[PDB]
Structure 1
Amino acid sequence: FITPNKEMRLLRDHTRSAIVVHRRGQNSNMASLSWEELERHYQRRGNA
């Protein structure tokens, strides 16, 4: 599935890995992660 950050809660329950693609200037980068690793990342963000 492709989605611009919509229905994230729904994808989380029927897929096991996400491909986070983000933009910086003219270049684009993609990083593949599991939902749980991204959860750990969000928990680190939670200390802010």
Structure 2
Amino acid sequence: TASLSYALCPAGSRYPLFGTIILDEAFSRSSHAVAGRIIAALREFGLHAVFITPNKEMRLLRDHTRSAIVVHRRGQNSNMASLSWEELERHYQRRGNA
């Protein structure tokens, strides 16, 4: 991340012109103690981070991102929808009636 942050800064500029950094399998081996430091360093270097997780450490994502893309499989076709954390919380509350 540090190397990329340097690389994407145009000569004579302190902030990278391109800011989006992906992380597939973002935290597959890191407990919260390490993932928090990862997040802090990632944000420190000026990048905006897009994370992917297969339903792991859900609480951590809620604490450092504002929207989530919920993708589900159905046969041979996959659907994608974009929601905010609060809309998803309301959806869960609707399931809270059960």
Task: Calculate the TM-score normalised by the size of structure 1.
Answer: 0.98
The alignment partner of 2:88 has SS state of helix
Question: Which structure has more RCO (C-alpha within 8 Å, separation ≥ 6)?
Answer: 1
Q: Which has the higher strand share?
A: 1
In the TM superposition, what whole-angstrom CA distance separates every residue of 1:1-48 from its partner, at most 9, and x where no partner exists? Answer: 000000100000000000000000000000000000000000000101
Counterpart in 2 of 1:14?
A: 64
User: Which consecutive residues of structure 2, in runs of 5 or more, have no partner in the other structure?
Assistant: 1-50
Specify the structure having the higher radius of gyration (Cα).
Answer: 2
Counterpart-to-counterpart distance in 2, 1:13 and 1:34: 13
Percent identity between the aligned chains? 100
Following superposition, which runs of at least 4 residues in structure 1 exceed 2 angstroms of deviation? Answer: none
The alignment partner of 1:19 has SS state of strand
CA RMSD of aligned residues (A): 0.3
Task: Calculate the TM-score normalised by the size of structure 2.
Answer: 0.49
User: Which consecutive residues of structure 1, in runs of 5 or more, have no partner in the other structure?
Assistant: none
